[PDB]
Each structure stands twice: as C-alpha cells, then as structure tokens.
C-alpha cells in the first residue's frame, strides 16, 4: 500500500484516501446459514472501485517513466466510473484527460467529468460504445503524447487488487475466506483478489458474475444489458480465467431488485452491480455446503451516481 491509518493521520493528497475500504457483514438481508461480507468499494473517495485502477495507472505508469505530467494526455472510452476516476486523478496530477462517450449519455455523466476539467468528446449516438472506443483509439494513434488508459488490458489493474484489495480482505476476515464473488467488468477486482488469496494459501472458490443477458464468459453471445459496471461483451485481457471456479449469471432484474432491497434492509446504497454481486452471494449462501462458511463479495460503487438510471425508476415512478 503501504498501510496508512487514515483515521489517525493527515493525508498529503486525496489519492492516499483510495483503498483501505471498510468491510461489512450482510445482516437483515442474509437469511442463510453462511456469513456474507461486503467489501465496501463504494467508500472510495470518488465513490467506486475504479479509484484503485485510476491511481494504479497514474502512479505505476509515472514510476515506470511512461507518463509525464503536463506532457502525456490520458485518453479512455468510458461512460462509467473509469472515466470519472481518470478525470478526478488526472486533474490533481497535472494530466490533460480526454474521455470519449456517446452523444446520448445523460447530462450527469458528461457534467461530472467536466467538473474535474476533463475534455469529453461525444461520439455519434447511433454508433454506441463502439464509436466512442474507435474515437479514443484514433486520438491515441494520431498523437504521440496521447496514450490509452487501456483499462481492459493494462497489467496495472489486476496488480493493484493483488497488492491492496485482496490483502485488505484477508486481514479483515481474519484469514478466513471460503468464496470470493465479483462481477467482471475489466476483471481486475476478481483476478487480483483471487491472486492474493491463493498466495496466502486460501482455498477460496472464486466466482465471476456476468449478466444473464450478455453471458460471454459462459460461452454465449454479447448483448445490451442493464448491469452497469460489468459485462463488456468480450473477455478482457485483464481477466485471468484460469483462476475462476465458477461463472454465475445474474439477470439485470434480480440485480435491480436486490439493490432496492439492500438499502432498506441493511442501509447499503449501491449501483446495479452491487445488487448483482449480493444476489449472487445470497444464491451461493443458500447452497447447503456453504453452511457456516464465509462468502466475500464487493459493493463496487455508491448509489447516488445511479439516482437517474433504470435502477431506482421504481422509486422515481412511485415518487
């Protein structure tokens, strides 16, 4: 990390507040005989797990000599949390950041990035995320100083989770993990935590979650789905499939139901993907072999970012 008790010292920069997040037992929602522990990545300073990947890319690339503040331009295609965390850290590190995303995206997504002074390049709506990806590649191809964050392939991504997320989990659960479950977006969280757990001698079963409507790891066809943050519709190079014991599909509507229930049951307020992870954890926890075992999963992002999405439409409609 190195470990740094935030509750007892004054940080020199906001990036020292990233990681070392809390862990929380699922209680009222957990009606099973297994313990379920939630790694609260929603509590990062920009409210999601991507703060760890942002920091890892800036810190490790600079240290290796591949980024130079005020010269390098960091470019990425993202209509979600990676673009936020890149924009937030690029600002305080003196990098120009360009994020591409379709024209059709909500004012909130565009506006949050411009607060942190990122340049947002909007691509034609009809081309979808493919069009935003192509624009980011062309920008980086044309300009020597422009480089791709490359969230889906960068070696920094699994590495940060192996060095931080996974050893935090290990200490918090007192070296006791029987199953680790995470939705795969880039695959960094699952891959890095699975690496750390195995290095510590844990026999935890490693479970990857994906949307039923885009079941790519399971061998099916990519498609549009609701579970923001996971399910890219290809197998990311970051993901090391050799570490996975089971791929479990979760339907977007089970994720959405579970998110709504979690707020009221346990006070956990998250996005679609924390609903999918908890649905999957509870499913595993019902398996009779898991009686008395400890299941760990992740709450990737805080709910306030999703107030305008399909996630809480049922509440919106009700209001």
């Amino acid at each position: 990390a190195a470990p740094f008790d935030k509750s007892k010292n004054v940080a020199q920069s906001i990036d020292q507040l990233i990681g070392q997040t809390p862990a929380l037992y699922l209680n009222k929602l957990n009606n099973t005989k297994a313990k379920v522990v939630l790694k609260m990545e929603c509590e990062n300073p920009m409210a999601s797990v991507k703060d760890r990947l942002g920091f890892a890319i800036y810190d490790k690339a600079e240290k290796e000599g591949k980024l130079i503040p005020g010269k390098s331009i960091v470019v990425e295609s993202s209509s979600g949390n990676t673009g936020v965390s890149l924009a937030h850290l690029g600002a305080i590190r003196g990098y120009k950041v360009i994020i591409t995303m379709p024209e059709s995206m909500s004012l909130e997504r565009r506006c949050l990035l411009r607060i942190f002074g990122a340049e947002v390049i909007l691509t034609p709506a009809a081309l979808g995320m493919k069009g935003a990806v192509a624009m980011a590649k062309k920008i980086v191809a044309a300009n020597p100083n422009a480089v791709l964050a490359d969230q889906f392939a960068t070696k920094y991504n699994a590495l940060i989770h192996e060095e931080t997320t996974g050893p935090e989990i290990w200490e918090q659960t007192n070296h006791n993990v029987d199953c680790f479950i995470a939705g795969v977006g880039t695959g960094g969280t699952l891959t890095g935590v699975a690496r750390a757990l195995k290095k510590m001698g844990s026999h935890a079963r490693i479970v990857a979650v994906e949307p039923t409507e885009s079941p790519v790891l399971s061998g099916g066809k990519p498609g549009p789905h609701k579970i923001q943050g996971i399910g890219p519709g290809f197998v990311p190079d970051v993901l090391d499939r050799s570490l996975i014991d089971e791929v479990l599909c979760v339907a977007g509507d089970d994720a959405i139901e579970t998110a709504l229930k979690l707020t009221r049951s346990d006070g956990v307020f998250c996005g679609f993907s924390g609903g999918a992870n908890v649905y999957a954890a509870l499913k595993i926890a019902e398996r009779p072999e898991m009686e008395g075992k400890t299941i760990v999963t992740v709450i990737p992002s805080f709910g306030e970012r999703y107030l305008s999405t399909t996630l809480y439409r049922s509440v919106r409609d009700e209001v």
């Binding site: 979808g128 995320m129 885009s214 990519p222 549009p224 923001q228 399910g231 890219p232």
Partner: peptide
C-alpha cells in the same frame, strides 16, 4: 450495453 456497457458502461465501465
């Protein structure tokens, strides 16, 4: 689809 995807938003990551």
């Amino acid at each position: 689809d995807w938003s990551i």
